[PDB]
Amino acid sequence: MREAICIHIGQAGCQVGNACWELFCLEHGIQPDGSMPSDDAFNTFFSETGAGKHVPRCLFLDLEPTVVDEVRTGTYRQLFNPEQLVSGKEDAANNYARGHYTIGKEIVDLALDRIRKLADNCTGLQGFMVFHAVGGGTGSGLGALLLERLSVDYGKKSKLGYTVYPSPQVSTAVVEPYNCVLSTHSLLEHTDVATMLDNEAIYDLTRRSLDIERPSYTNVNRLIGQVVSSLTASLRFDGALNVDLTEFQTNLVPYPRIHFVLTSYAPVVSAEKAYHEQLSVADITNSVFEPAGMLTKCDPRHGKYMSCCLMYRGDVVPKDVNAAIATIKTKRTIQFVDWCPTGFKCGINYQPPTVVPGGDLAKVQRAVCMIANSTAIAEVFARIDHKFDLMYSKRAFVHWYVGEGMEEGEFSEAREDLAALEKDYEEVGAES
Amino acid sequence: MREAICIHIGQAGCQVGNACWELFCLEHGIQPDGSMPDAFNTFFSETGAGKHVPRCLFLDLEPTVVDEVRTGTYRQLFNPEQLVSGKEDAANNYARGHYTIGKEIVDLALDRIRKLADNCTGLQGFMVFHAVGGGTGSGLGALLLERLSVDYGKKSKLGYTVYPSPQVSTAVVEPYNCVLSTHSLLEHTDVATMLDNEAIYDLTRRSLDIERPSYTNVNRLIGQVVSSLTASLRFDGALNVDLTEFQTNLVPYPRIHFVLTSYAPVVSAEKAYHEQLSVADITNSVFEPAGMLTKCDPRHGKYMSCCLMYRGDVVPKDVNAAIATIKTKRTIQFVDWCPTGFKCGINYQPPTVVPGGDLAKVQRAVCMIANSTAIAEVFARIDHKFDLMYSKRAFVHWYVGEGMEEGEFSEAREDLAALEKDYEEVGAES
Amino acid sequence: IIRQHRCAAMEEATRREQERIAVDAVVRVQEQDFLENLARRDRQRRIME
Amino acid sequence: ARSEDDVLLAFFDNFCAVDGAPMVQLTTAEMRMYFVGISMRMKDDTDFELWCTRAFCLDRHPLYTTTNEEYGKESTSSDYKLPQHGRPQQFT
Amino acid sequence: REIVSCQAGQCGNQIGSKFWEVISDEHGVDPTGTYQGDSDLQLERINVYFDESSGGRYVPRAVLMDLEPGTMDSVRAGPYGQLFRPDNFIFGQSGAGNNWAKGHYTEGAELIDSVLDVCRKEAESCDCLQGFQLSHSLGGGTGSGMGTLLISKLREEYPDRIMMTFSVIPSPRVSDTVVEPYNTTLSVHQLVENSDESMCIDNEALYDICFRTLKLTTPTFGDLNHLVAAVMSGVTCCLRFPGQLNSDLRKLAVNLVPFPRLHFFMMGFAPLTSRGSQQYRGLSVAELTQQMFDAKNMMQAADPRHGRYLTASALFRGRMSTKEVDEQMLNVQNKNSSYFIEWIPNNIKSSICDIPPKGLKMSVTFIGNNTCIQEMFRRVGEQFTGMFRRKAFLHWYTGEGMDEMEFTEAESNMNDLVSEYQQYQDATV
Amino acid sequence: REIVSCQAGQCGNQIGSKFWEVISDEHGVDPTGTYQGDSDLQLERINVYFDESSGGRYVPRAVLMDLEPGTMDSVRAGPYGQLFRPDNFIFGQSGAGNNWAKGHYTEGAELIDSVLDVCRKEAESCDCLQGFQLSHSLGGGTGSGMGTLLISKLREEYPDRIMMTFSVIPSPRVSDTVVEPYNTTLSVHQLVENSDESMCIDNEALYDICFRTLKLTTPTFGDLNHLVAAVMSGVTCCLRFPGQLNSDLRKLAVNLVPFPRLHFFMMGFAPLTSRGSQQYRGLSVAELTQQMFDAKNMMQAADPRHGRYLTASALFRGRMSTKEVDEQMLNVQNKNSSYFIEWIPNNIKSSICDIPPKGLKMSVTFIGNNTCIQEMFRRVGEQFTGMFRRKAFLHWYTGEGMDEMEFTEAESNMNDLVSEYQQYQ
C-alpha cells in the first residue's frame, strides 16, 4: 500500500540518498542489517520479506562506481540489495551528451529492468522520488533518459524530482550551466513536480541557523533528507490532515507547464539554540516564511506566491495552523497572486521529525516544511540563462557535445525552451 | 500580563542587570539553571519546558561582558540571543556609539526588542539600565531611546541612569557624554531615575559599615530599589500601584521627569537587631538626606511629588501616621501647588535578602522616588563641568572625527540651560 | 543528552587535534637531513684518506 | 599490525637468557654484536643507517576570581522559595 | 578506470620513476611488490595504476622506454627498479643524441613497433582503460620526437581514450642543449594534434619553488621531481580514492578545455613550506588558497598576472568543508576578477577527495589553462627562428631525413598556437 | 580586539621578545607553544596576542625586523625564541650603521615591502584588529627609521586603527652614541602625526628605578625589559581579562589625548619593591596610588613638579574595591590641584581589571600625558641645533639620498611640538 519508489541518479543523487535513507531507517526503527527488533508504516519505503528482512525501495545509479562502491562497503551494505545498486564503468564527466547518448543507453535498459522489478512488487505505488543534480553529466543526461523512459512506459504516475540546480553564485563546473539548460527541457516535459535545491541558500542557512563554521555536503544532504521525510511522512504516519502524492501535487500545480517549487523547512535551529526558545507553531511558520530560512536562492519579495503547501509534523493543531495562516495573510511583506485567494494547503501529522546521531539538527516538538509554487523561480532561471548565453556566444565547451553525438541545434532548442519558461512565468504572474 | 521588558546597555547596564536578575531569581525562586525546585510573569517568560527565560535584552559594543554572562552561573538561564555585543567598544565616545559603531547593532537590538515584545501580551513598559558616563551607555542608549519612541509611541519607558558624580568621576569625556545624552533622556524617557555612585557609596559606608564598598554592593542596592519599585504589580498589596499609576502622579509636566531615589531601612546584620524599624522610623530615615541614592540635598530644593512604596508588614495606619509626621516637621518643604504630594503603594511581600550580600533581613522597608526642584544643583554642576571643558575645545576632535557636527554640543548645552531654567521656574513660589 | 553528546563530540575533535599534533611532529625531513649529514661526513673522511 | 608493547616485547625477547629470565645487564660488546647482526641482516649501508637512526633517535580558581562571578557565588538551591503573597488565581 | 603510464627519455624516465615511488607510498606498496598499507582504501582502487599477479605482487602498469640503455639500467638498479615488469623495459642500442629526427624517424621508428605491442598488451588486460599518460621532456631528442610518435600511434589506435602528456618544457636559463628550440618546435605540433592534454613543466619554476618557497639549499633532480610527482599523484586522486565531489581525467578535460586546441596547462602544488616553518604555519584551507594562485607556488615559469585564466580546476585532498573550499574560491574569483575571463564566470572548478597525501593534513593540485602559457611558446619560437634563419644545427636533421618544409610547418603551427592563445587574452564580450 | 605587534631594531627586538616572554608566562604558554595554564580566562581571550595554528600552537602575532641578523639570531636563541614564526623573522644583510637615513630611505625602504606583506597577512588573519603596536628606540638607526616608516605605512593602510608605539628615548646622562639627537628628531616628527599614542621610556630613569626603588645591585637590559614589559602587559590587560571598569586602546586614547598631537605619555608601574622590603610593604590601594604618583617610580626622566598633568590614567589590576580607588583619585586631585590642570578638573581616569599580573597582590599601570614631557624634547632639540649649526655628521646622512632640508623640517617640528606643550604648561 501507498508505496513510493526512490531513484537516486548521479553522484549528488547517491550522496543525498544516503542521508535520506539513513533518516528513513532511523525514523522507522530499522537496524542497518534490515530488521526491526522491537504497524505497516514502513510499507512505503521498505519491502517486507518472508524471512523478516526489510529491503528499501530504492535504486542507486552512477556511471562512476565510486559512490555505489562506497555504499556497498558502508555500514548499510546488509540493508541495501546487491541489485538496485547499479554502477557504470566510466562517468559522464559533466557531459549531458555522454549521459544521454553514448554511455547512458548501455545502462538505461538495466535501470528500467530494475525499476520494473521494484514496481511489480508494489501494489499501491504512489509515485517516484528522483534525486539528481542537473549540474552533472549523468545527473542531467542519464536522469533525463531515465525520466523519459519511465514516463513513456509507466503512464501518468506521480513523479517528484529533487534537483540541485546550478547555484547562481557558487558552482563546481564551467559546463554546468550547459548541462542545466540541456536538462531543463526534459525535466520540464517529463518530471511532474520539480523541487529547487540550490546551494547558497542551504549553506548560508546552515552557517547562520546551525552556527557551524564548516557546513558541508553531508549536512546539506541531511537537511534535504529531512525535507523529503517531512514531505512524505503524511502517508507514512496517521495525521489530522493526510495528503498523498496526488493530493498535494494537484494543489501545487496550477498549470501543466509550471510545477517548479521552492522549499523551506523550519525550525531548522542549532542544538544549543533548541530549548532556549519557545518554538510555537506561529513562530515556526513565520520563520519558514522568512526569506532567510528558505532552501532556494530566490527571495520571495521579488516574486508572487502562487500556491503554498505546509507539511506540519508534531503536536501541531489545526487551531495554530489556521492562526499562523491568518497572521501570514495579514502580513503584507509577502504577496500572493490575485487569482488564487486561498493559496494555502495544510497537511498535519502527529509524528515528530527524528534527528540522526551526530547530526547538527535538534529534535523538537513540531516542524513544518514549505513547498510553494511561486514566481520567484523565474529569476533563478534568468540567472542560469545569463550564465549560459554568454558562454554559448562563441561556442565554449561545445566541441565535446558535438563530437559525443549531439546535434548543435539542440543547444539552441534548450535555450529557447528555457526562455519559454521565463516568459511563461512572467505571463502567468502578470496581473489580470 | 503586566510584563516589563528590561534592556541593559553598557558596562553599568550589564552589571546592574546581573545584580537585578540575581535578585529576581531570588524573589521568584528560579534556579540559575532556570527552574523551580504566576507572579513571575512580569519578568520571566514561560516556555513549554517550565524553564523561565528572563524578559531581558543585554546590549553592548565590546564582547567582555556578554562573554562573562555566557560563561557565568546564569548561562543556562539567559537566552543565548538577547545577550548581544558588537566587536569594538564605543570607547567613551557618544559620537561613536550614536553615529558610527552603534548603527550596525541598533537594527539587531530592535529585532530583539520585537522578539521580546511579541512574546508578551500585556507589556506595561520598558526599563533601560545604563550609565551615560561612558560611550555606549550614552550613545547607543540614546539611539535605542529614539528607536523605541518611534516604534512604540506612548509606551511607558523607565530609564535607570547613573549620571556622573558632582564631585569625582571615572572619565574625562564623561561630562561630554552626559550632556550629549540628557537631550535624549529628556525627550524620549517618560521617567528617568538618578543612580549616581556617590550617595550609594556614602550610604554603604555610613549605614552598612562596609569598609570596602564596591560596584557589587552598589548594583545590589540598585537591584533592591528596582525590585521594590516593580514588586507592586508582582505581589498583592493593600494599595497596589502600576507603571502608569505612579508615572501620572510622579511627573507633573512632561519635561519634569527626573527623580531621586531613597531606600530605607538599609542596615547591616549587627545594626538591624538594635533598632525598632517601625514605619515612622523608616519614613524619617528615607526623608533623611543621608539615605538617598543620589547626592542631591532636598533642603536646597522643593519637593513636588514623592512616590513612597512600602514592602512587608506595613499598614496604612502607620503609613498615614508617618505622612502626618512628615507634614508636621518643617525641616522639609513641599511646593505650593501640591499639598498632598504623596503617592503611597503597599506590598505584602517583604524584600528578600540576597544571601552572601550586605543587606539584612528586615520585616518592612520602603523605597521613595521623588520629583523635586533640587536636581537643578546637579544639573548646574554638570553644565559648569561641560562649559569649563568646552571653553577651549577639549576632547572635541575625538567626538567630531566620527561623522559628528560640532554644533550639537552647543544645542545640548542650551538644552541643559533650558532644563535648569524650567526646574527653577516650576520651583518658584506663587 | 544531546548536550552531553555534543560535548563528547567536541572532546573527540580535541583528541583528533592532538593526534594531528602527533603527526605534525612526526612530519622525516629532519631524518633525511641527518642522513645527508652522515653522507657529507663520510665523503669528507674518504676524501681525507 | 602490532602495538608499542608488542614491538618492545619482541625486541626484548632477543636479549633473554637461556633459562628465560629477562636479562637486564648489557654491555657495549653485545650491543655492538647486535648491531653487526643487523648489519648482516640488511646489506645496504643507507638502509642500515636509516634503521639505526630510526630506532635510536641519534640526533632527534583562587588566583583568578571575577567580581561579576561573585554575584551568584554564594547563593544555593536552599535559598529559593516562592513568594508567600503572590498574585491570586488567574480568572482570565 | 585503469590508467597506464609510459615514460619516455631520460627526464621522463626519472620523473616516472619518482612518480611510481610516490604512488607506491600512497597506496602502501613496498619496493619488493608486497602490500604494506595501513588500511583497505589503498587496496580498493589499487587496480587503477597497478596490476595484481598470481603471487600477489602489484606490478605497475608502466612502460619504461628510451633508446639509451643507461637510463634503463639506472632505473632498474634504483630503489624501486624491482617493481616494474622487465618485459616493459624496451631500449635500443645507440641513443638518439638529442636528435628529434633520430628519435622519430630512424632509431625510434624500429622500436616504436615493439613499444606499441607492449602498450596494447598492457591495455588489453585493463577492464575499462581510462587512458594513457606519457611522462617526457620536449628538450630531448628521444624524449620528445619518439614520445610524440608514441602519442600519434596511440591516438590512431585508441580514439576515445585520454592521453595525458606531462612535458618538461626546456628553458635556456636552465639550458642543457643547443637544439632545445628545434626539438620543442618539432614536438609541440604533434602534442597539439594528438595528445588530449599537454601539461607544461618549466624547470626554471621548479628551481624557483625549490629556492624561494621550499628553501632547499641543494635541491637535486630528486627534489625537483618530488613536486611533479605530487602533481601526477593529485591529478588522479578521485579515481583511486572516494571523495565528497569526484572527478577524473574526462572531468578535467571537459571543464578545462573550451576549444579543441586549447589544451595546455600549468601546475601548482599546495601547500609548500620550508623545513622550519612546517609546523609553525597553520595548515589551513585559507593559507592553502592564499598559496594557491601566487606565481611562487607555480612550477611553470610564466607569471600568471601577465595573462588571463581561461579555466582553472583545483583538486583538493583531505577532510574539508564546502564553505571552506568553494566560498573562498568565489572570493578569489571576485578579488582577482581582472585575471579571469569575463565570458566564463566561475572560471575555476572545485573537486574534493577524502584521502590526503600521506603525512600531510590537506593538499590541493592546481590545473589551470591561462593565456600566459604562450610566453614560453613565443620566447622559444624566437630562438627557433633565430637558429633556423642561418640553417644552424640542421644538417643532422636533413641527413636523417627531415626536409626544411617540415620545420617551416612546425614554426607555422607554433605561430598558430601562440596566436590562438593571444586572441583569447584581449577579447571583449 | 586582537592587537598585532612589531619590533624594530636591536633594542626593539630585545624588549619585544621580553614582552612576549612575560605575556606567554601570564597566559600560561610554554615556549613549546602549548597551553598549560590554570584557568579558563587565560584561553578566553588568548587570541588578542596569540594566533592559533592548525594545531592550536599559539604563535605570537608579532613581526620582528632589524637590518642586522645578529639580533635575530639572539632572539631565536633566547629561551622563548622558538615560540615565534620563522617567516616573521624578516631581516637584511647589511646593518643600518646607526643611520636613520639608511634605516628609512635605502635599506629600510627596500626591505619594507615584505614587512608590510607580513603585517597585512597578520591583519587578514585577525578577525577584528584592535590595533598595531610597535616597539623600538628612537636613538638608533634601523630601530628609529624602520619604525617611523612602519608607522607611516601602517597609518596610510589602516587609518582608523589604533597605533601604539613604545619608543625608548635616549637621555644626555646615559647617551652611548653621537647621533641620537639626529635620529630622534627625524623620528619624533613622524611619530607626532603617524602614531595615535606614543609612550616614551628612558634608560636613565629605568636605571634610577632599578638602583633605588628595586635596590638591585646589577640589573641589566633584561631587567629594564622586565620593567617595560610589565608596562606593555598592563596597558592592554583590560583587552584580555574582564574587570569592574574595563578599558581598551581607544578608551585610553580618547581619555588621554585632549588635542590630536599631544599623545606622548610618560609611564610608571606599581608596586615595585626589593626582596628585603617586600615583607615590610603593606600593599593596598593607597600605597599603590602614592608609589605610582611619586616621581622616582616613573621611568620618564621628567620631574612632575616641573609640569602639570594634562591627563592621567590608572589601569589597576587585581581584586580590589572601587570605593578606595575613587577616594584616592578624588583626594589626590583635591590635595594636589596645583599639579593638575584647572580647566579639566578630574584629569585622572581609573580602570579596574580583575586579573592581576602574577607575582603581586594587585598592581597598577600609569599613563601620564604630563606637560613635563617637553623637557626631553627641548634638551634633545638643543643637542640637534648645536650639531646642525656646525654641520656635524651631515655627510653620512646626506649620502643616502637625503638632504639638509628634512633635518631643517624635523628641528622645526620638534620645536613647535615643544611650544604646544609649553602653551598648556
Ligand SMILES: Nc1nc2c(ncn2[C@@H]2O[C@H](COP(=O)(O)OP(=O)(O)OP(=O)(O)O)[C@@H](O)[C@H]2O)c(=O)[nH]1
Ligand atoms: N545538494 C547536494 N548537491 C551535490 C551533492 N553532490 C554533488 N552536488 C552538486 O551537484 C553537482 C552535480 O554533481 P556532479 O559532481 O557533477 O556528479 P554527477 O551529477 O553524478 O555527474 P558525474 O560527476 O559526471 O557523475 C555538483 O557540481 C555538485 O556541486 C550532494 O550530495 N548534495
Ligand SMILES: Nc1nc2c(ncn2[C@@H]2O[C@H](COP(=O)(O)OP(=O)(O)OP(=O)(O)O)[C@@H](O)[C@H]2O)c(=O)[nH]1
Ligand atoms: N553603579 C555602577 N556604575 C557603573 C558600573 N560600571 C560602570 N559604571 C558607570 O560607568 C561609568 C563609566 O563609563 P564606562 O566605564 O565607559 O562604562 P559604560 O558607560 O557602560 O561604557 P562602556 O565602557 O563603553 O561600556 C562610571 O562613571 C560608572 O558610573 C557598575 O558596576 N555600577
Ligand SMILES: Nc1nc2c(ncn2[C@@H]2O[C@H](COP(=O)(O)OP(=O)(O)O)[C@@H](O)[C@H]2O)c(=O)[nH]1
Ligand atoms: N625534472 C627533471 N628534469 C630532468 C632530469 N634530468 C634531466 N632533466 C631535464 O631534461 C633535459 C634533457 O633531456 P634529455 O635527458 O636529454 O632527454 P632525452 O635525451 O630524450 O632522454 C634537461 O634540460 C634537464 O633540465 C630529472 O631528473 N628531473
Ligand SMILES: Nc1nc2c(ncn2[C@@H]2O[C@H](COP(=O)(O)OP(=O)(O)O)[C@@H](O)[C@H]2O)c(=O)[nH]1
Ligand atoms: N631599555 C633598553 N634599552 C636598550 C636595550 N638595548 C639597547 N637599548 C638602548 O638603545 C640604544 C641603541 O639602539 P639600537 O638598538 O642600536 O637601535 P638600532 O641600531 O636602530 O637597532 C642604546 O643607547 C641603548 O641605551 C634594552 O634591552 N633595553
Ligand SMILES: [Mg+2]
Ligand atoms: Mg560523478
Ligand SMILES: [Mg+2]
Ligand atoms: Mg565598555
